Design a protein around this nucleic acid. Sequence first.
RNA 1: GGUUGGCCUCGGAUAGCCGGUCCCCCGCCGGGGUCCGGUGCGGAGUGCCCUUCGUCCUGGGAAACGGGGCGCGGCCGGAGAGGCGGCCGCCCCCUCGCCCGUCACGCACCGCACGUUCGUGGGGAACCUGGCGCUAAACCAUUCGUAGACGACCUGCUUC
RNA 2: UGGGCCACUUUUGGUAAGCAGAACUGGCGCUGCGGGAUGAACCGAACGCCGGGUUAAGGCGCCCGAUGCCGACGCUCAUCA
Lengths: 201, 100, 139, 123, 128, 109
Amino acid sequence: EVQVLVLDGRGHLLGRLAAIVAKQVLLGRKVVVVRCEGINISGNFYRNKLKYLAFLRKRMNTNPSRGPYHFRAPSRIFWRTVRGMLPHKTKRGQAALDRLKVFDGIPPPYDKKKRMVVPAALKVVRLKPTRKFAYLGRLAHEVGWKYQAVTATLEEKRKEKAKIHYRKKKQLMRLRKQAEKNVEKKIDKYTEVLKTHGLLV
Amino acid sequence: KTVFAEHISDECKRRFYKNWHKSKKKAFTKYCKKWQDEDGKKQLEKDFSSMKKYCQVIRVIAHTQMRLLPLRQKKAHLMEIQVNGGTVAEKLDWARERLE
Amino acid sequence: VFRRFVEVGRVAYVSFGPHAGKLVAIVDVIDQNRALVDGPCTQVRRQAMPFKCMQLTDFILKFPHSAHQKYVRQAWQKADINTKWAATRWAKKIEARERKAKMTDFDRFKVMKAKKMRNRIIKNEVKKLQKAALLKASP
Amino acid sequence: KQLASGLLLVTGPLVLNRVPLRRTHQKFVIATSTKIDISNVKIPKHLTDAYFKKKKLRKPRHQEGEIFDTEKEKYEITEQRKIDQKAVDSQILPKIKAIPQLQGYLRSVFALTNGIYPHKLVF
Amino acid sequence: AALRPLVKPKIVKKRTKKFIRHQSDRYVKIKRNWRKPRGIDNRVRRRFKGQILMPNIGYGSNKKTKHMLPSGFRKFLVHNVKELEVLLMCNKSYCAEIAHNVSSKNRKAIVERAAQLAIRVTNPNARL
Amino acid sequence: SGRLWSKAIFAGYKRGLRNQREHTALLKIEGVYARDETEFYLGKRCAYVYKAKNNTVTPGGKPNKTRVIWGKVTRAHGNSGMVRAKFRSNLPAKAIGHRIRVMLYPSRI
RNA sequence: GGUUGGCCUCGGAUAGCCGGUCCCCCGCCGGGGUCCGGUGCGGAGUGCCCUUCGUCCUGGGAAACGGGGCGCGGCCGGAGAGGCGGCCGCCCCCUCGCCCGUCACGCACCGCACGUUCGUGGGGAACCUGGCGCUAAACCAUUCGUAGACGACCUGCUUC
RNA sequence: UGGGCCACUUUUGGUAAGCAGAACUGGCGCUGCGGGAUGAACCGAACGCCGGGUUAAGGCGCCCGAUGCCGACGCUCAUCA
Ligand SMILES: [Mg+2]
Ligand SMILES: [Mg+2]
Ligand SMILES: [Mg+2]
Ligand SMILES: [Mg+2]
Ligand SMILES: [Mg+2]
Ligand SMILES: [Mg+2]
Ligand SMILES: [Mg+2]
Ligand SMILES: [Mg+2]
Ligand SMILES: [Mg+2]
Ligand SMILES: [Mg+2]
Ligand SMILES: [Mg+2]
Ligand SMILES: [Mg+2]
Ligand SMILES: [Mg+2]
Ligand SMILES: [Mg+2]
């Protein structure tokens, strides 16, 4: 596939989605992961927050300016998880890493696009229902992220625009159904041909 | 979006130049012409309404007046000052009426 | 919520495994994972099959638990499942998917021509429906 | 029919898809499951591989090539071939018009889109 | 055009790159000429992976095509016309080549003699 | 007037973890994700088509910048699509993650 | 140097979902409750939409309320990276294209690869060609001392 | 050559030691290769230059070849798993 694969990050497990994305990006296939604040992590929130705080403590003590860079936005947190699963210190890994674009919320080249979903990394199929999990958006917020509030208002405004679009899509589907009922005597011989070959039960 | 006033003072224009002596002081010369032609006002009026509709925090650009100071410097100092206390619409007209 | 259950006589459709695509009646249930199954009229002899392969249907046969083959069959033939199913919309949609896969290159070509013109008529009518719906001038 | 050298003798119904009486290799074709009963057809006897073998002209009495052979770049469709093609197609065209939209099917070309995959297609 | 050999088998070389001496790249005092590394801790001598290869007898060329020039022939160095005459009856597997010291006027006579003897010369135009 | 070849992709050479055998290459064919699905392609000719600077001769056409390294599918490599192929010369490492064509050439269908 | 059709988007739940409708309430569209369907999702991404051999005679059907003109002009929407999408008036043509038929033709290049797209691709100089536009700064040198190891930095230099 | 060292098991001194001293076999030294991420000695296997096939030990989320099996049955929630 030559087009860009756009994945909605909501409801996905951080390391299971990164596993899919890393291999997909190493075979070409420019990948876009949006809504990185909706990514889930298994286990209760507190033990996941402790895991990042321990990561925050990893720091070059002689010069922290050079040490590990603790990125705080969920998109940058996700990008680093994929980074830790590519051979990023070789030309192939860097070239693969540049094929991945990660976003918080859905910026408006992708809000008007259909978003894919990876079932093999979804929280609902990979986690038992009676298990605790953490949201990447809340984990990042309490670790230093500063744009959870504004992204929420922008995400909400995007959701009002999407409802208007889905309002119309149901409108033009209701019209097309009434149309198909309207023109049946002139379509019946054509519908049957499509019927006998599997399409249109 | 940034919108400037017509008739910007010379000491303010001095800040845009590293060498006033060798310059011909053309800064903002094609800009102020849009405050006077009829096409430009509708461009500036639309620029103000869009700032009123889409912006959250607005600031005014103000400069000090060197000519009233005992310093050798004639070059003014520029600074954005945040305008607080009101809706964006009503702090936009507040800054408009204080332009120039 | 929870319309269909695993009981004695419940007809289940087998999705994968050696008997994929077959119908089967749950004769008994063992150890929470397997179930004694029996398709006497669908060519599936009595055996144990896991619940993972099954997909329950809305048909239920009234016979005692762990009954013999002949009693499960007579219950299957009376109120015959082979005709209620297959002429059920789940099954005829399974049939549609089957004939779509076995569609040949020429059949694919004839489908494309009909589908090109099937749409052309619908697209035109929707354009007529939208314009004939647009004349609205009521305060 | 198949030729004595293993090459398949195929025709496009030249009127339909512009493929004349021409040999093709069994291994570089795809057998679609669509047939026409070409029983009761008279394929002329002189349609062998020697008939279809490529011809040549160069080079008569010329060794050092400085004046170039500015002819024969137009391979000539011999009047014979036009007659054999006319004979075969005239008794194969009506048999194609018999089954619906076979003429339209033959006018089209096979292709792969960004959907279907060859290992899944039934031919 | 040129004189064809008696037979032209496919020449198969088990290795085309030269065997360079260990650490010959790091120094100018160390020439490319192969030297077997007799060092107690040498990793090339121990034959570690990814190291410089050591030549051995397994790389030997086929008996049939050994010493064959890239065109079906085997070399023979000649210094005068008399040494040309010895190649008259091989003529199809061995080609003469003139030594570097042979003067311009003398090697002209060697080239003319080989032409009428159907002997292939690897350097037939070397003083003109 | 049509694509006429299935689009594979060059994933790497057949290798261990620390040893890489460049004489065979592993291909990921689109739409095939099981070993039993690879039987269709198990002999098809594959091509790595690329461009360069200098014009090269083109069979049946005027010289242009397009070049090709030919090959063919040898067998399946492991439980999920993943054909492995042999090329007339080992593919360059620059081609990893790039397009390989599977030509529907010699056909058994 | 890549590539070899597009998908222009609800929010989501998963011990539940989706669609449609009659009565209430929100300055003639939205929200509630009834009712009706579908649910191994068929209003289906295991999906949908385009579909290319081209023309000339020649009818039947779809349409006639139409299309295509980078043709013009205007309006509207989009700000999270809007770099985009949509709607009207004018002018050119023709019943052309879409399905099924009639009719014959085209290099039919004598079995053969890198064919077929994006694409009028990106980047760098250069010629010719018309129309509309503009005529600047930076650094050095010199001053300053709010600065300073040197660089750097803060300053001034024909007019009221 | 007459400095040896290590591992299974047996074994002496010592609280013990990557300590000191013995017995047997194997190894490293003198030895590269696959695995144990890394490693003189562990596991597999010992080596001329190559092509095809198949294995050992070990593995098959991604790094990283291979489970992208509709794998089977349980157990387990850890605010230092
Ligand atoms: Mg900070
Ligand atoms: Mg050599
Ligand atoms: Mg050297
Ligand atoms: Mg040593
Ligand atoms: Mg000399
Ligand atoms: Mg000694
Ligand atoms: Mg000891
Ligand atoms: Mg030894
Ligand atoms: Mg050893
Ligand atoms: Mg090892
Ligand atoms: Mg270890
Ligand atoms: Mg081998
Ligand atoms: Mg491993
Ligand atoms: Mg892998």
